[PDB]
Design a protein around this ligand. Structure first.
Ligand SMILES: Nc1nc2c(ncn2[C@@H]2O[C@H](COP(=O)(O)OP(=O)(O)O)[C@@H](O)[C@H]2O)c(=O)[nH]1
Ligand SMILES: [Mg+2]
Length: 379
C-alpha cells in the first residue's frame, strides 16, 4: 500500500510562476523518523534529457543496499522517470562512521530559478553536463559567486558545501582519464583564470564559495542507452567501462564517509530545519544577492525557532502525557526560558535586531502550546 517514489515539491506552472507543495514537503521531511535528523541534501541538476534520472536510479540502487558488493545489479532500471524538483519520498537514514544517523534526501532538479533553488538547498550538488564544461555552464554559477561574496563579507564560513561537475560522454580519455582524478585535472584547466570578464570573475571566486569542488569524467554508456528513452534492458546492455566508472562514482558521492551534512553559518541543518530553507527561498523566486542573503538569514533564524520550540514541546508532552495548575505553570515557565536560552545561544544570521523578531515568534508559539496544554490538563 505504501511505496517510495518521486514527489513533485516545486512546479513551474503555465504562467511561469513557481509553487512549492508545502503539504508534500512537510509529509516527507517532518515525519517522526527523520524530522530531527541532520540532513544531507543531494541534488542532480542540469539540462533536460542528459541522463539525470538514469543516474539517480543507480543512486537509488546503492542507497538501498550500500553494504552489498553487488549493489549495481538483466535487472530493469526503476525509480525517477517538466521543470521543477522531485524528491524521493524515502529519506534514507544512513549510519555515519562517527555514530550519527544522518538523513539523506535525493532531489532530481529538472530554468535558472529551479537551478538556483536546488543549489541553495543542496549540500551535494551534482551538476550534470554533456561532453564538456562550456562558458555558459560556468556563467550559471555567477550569481552563486556574487551571493557568496556578500555572505562572506564578515565571516570565513562558506555558503555552499559540495559541487560536482559530472561530465557525461567524456571525449578526451587519454589526457584526462575517466573518473575523479582526470576530472580534477580537467577542471583545473577549465577553471584557470581566463574570456568574458564575468567569466574570469567566476573562476577567481568559485572556490571561495564552495567547500568542495570536484569533477568526475564518465564514459559514454553505449548505443543502447544513448538511443532509447525508457531503456528497459540488461546491465549487460550498458557499456562495461561506463559500469566500471559508475560503480566508483556513486559511492564516491554517497558512501557514509562521503555524506556531507547541510550546514549554514556553522549550524548543522535537520530535515525540520531544511523545510524552513525551502519556504524562505521560494518567496524570493532572478533575485538579488541581498534578497538571497536575507532569505538565508530568515530561514536560519526560523530553523532555530523550530528547534527551540520542538524542545519545549516534547519536554512538555513528557510532563502532560494530572498536575497542579501552578506546578504546570512553573514547569512551563522553566521549560520556556530554557527554549529561549537555547534560541539565543544559536549562532544566527542577521544581527540581534533581526533575530529579536524571531525570538518573539518563538515565545508566542510556545505560549500557544502552553494554552493547549492547560486545556489538556483541565480535562
Ligand atoms: N548519451 C548518453 N545518454 C544517456 C546517458 N545516461 C542516460 N542516457 C540516456 O539519455 C536519455 C534521457 O535520459 P534521462 O535520464 O531521462 O535524462 P534527464 O532528463 O536528464 O533526467 C535516455 O535515453 C537515457 O537512456 C549518458 O551518459 N550518455
Ligand atoms: Mg530529471
Amino acid at each position: 500500500v505504501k511505496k517510495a517514489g518521486p514527489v513533485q515539491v516545486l512546479i513551474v506552472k503555465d504562467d511561469h510562476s513557481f509553487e512549492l507543495d508545502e503539504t508534500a514537503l512537510n509529509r516527507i521531511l517532518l515525519s517522526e523518523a527523520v524530522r530531527d535528523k541532520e540532513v544531507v541534501a543531494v541534488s542532480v541538476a542540469g539540462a533536460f534529457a542528459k541522463g539525470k534520472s538514469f543516474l539517480m536510479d543507480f543512486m537509488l540502487r546503492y542507497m538501498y543496499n550500500q553494504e552489498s558488493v553487488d549493489w549495481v545489479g538483466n535487472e530493469p532500471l526503476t525509480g525517477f522517470s517538466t521543470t521543477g524538483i522531485q524528491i524521493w519520498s524515502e529519506i534514507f537514514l544512513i549510519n555515519k562512521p562517527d555514530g550519527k544517523k544522518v538523513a539523506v534526501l535525493l532531489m532530481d532538479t529538472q530554468s535558472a530559478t529551479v537551478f538556483a533553488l536546488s543549489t541553495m538547498i543542496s549540500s551535494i550538488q551534482v551538476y550534470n553536463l554533456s561532453q564538456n564544461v562550456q562558458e555558459d555552464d560556468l556563467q550559471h554559477l555567477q550569481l552563486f559567486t556574487e551571493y557568496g561574496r556578500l555572505a562572506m563579507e564578515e565571516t570565513f564560513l562558506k555558503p555552499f558545501q559540495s559541487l560536482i561537475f559530472l561530465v557525461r560522454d567524456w571525449s578526451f580519455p587519454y589526457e584526462f582519464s575517466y573518473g575523479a582524478d582526470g576530472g580534477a585535472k580537467f577542471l583545473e584547466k577549465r577553471l584557470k583564470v581566463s574570456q568574458h570578464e564575468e567569466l574570469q570573475n567566476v573562476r577567481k571566486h568559485i572556490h571561495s564559495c564552495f567547500t568542495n569542488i570536484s569533477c568526475f569524467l564518465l564514459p559514454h554508456p553505449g548505443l543502447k542507452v544513448a538511443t532509447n528513452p525508457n531503456f528497459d534492458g540488461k546491465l549487460k546492455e550498458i557499456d562495461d567501462e561506463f559500469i566500471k566508472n559508475l560503480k566508483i562514482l556513486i559511492p564516491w558521492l554517497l558512501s557514509p564517509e562521503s555524506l556531507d551534512i547541510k550546514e549554514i553559518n556553522g549550524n548543522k541543518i535537520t530535515c525540520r530545519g531544511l523545510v524552513e530553507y525551502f519556504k524562505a527561498y521560494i518567496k524570493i523566486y532572478l533575485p538579488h544577492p541581498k534578497s538571497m542573503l536575507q532569505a538565508t538569514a530568515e530561514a536560519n533564524n526560523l530553523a532555530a525557532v523550530a528547534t527551540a520550540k520542538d524542545t519545549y514541546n516534547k519536554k512538555m508532552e513528557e510532563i502532560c502525557g494530572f498536575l497542579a495548575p501552578n506546578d504546570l505553570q512553573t514547569k512551563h515557565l522553566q521549560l520556556k526560558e530554557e527554549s529561549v536560552k537555547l534560541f539565543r545561544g544559536v549562532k544566527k544570521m542577521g544581527g540581534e535586531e533581526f533575530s529579536r523578531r524571531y525570538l518573539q515568534q518563538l515565545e508566542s508559539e510556545i505560549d500557544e502550546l502552553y494554552i493547549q496544554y492547560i486545556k489538556h490538563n483541565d480535562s
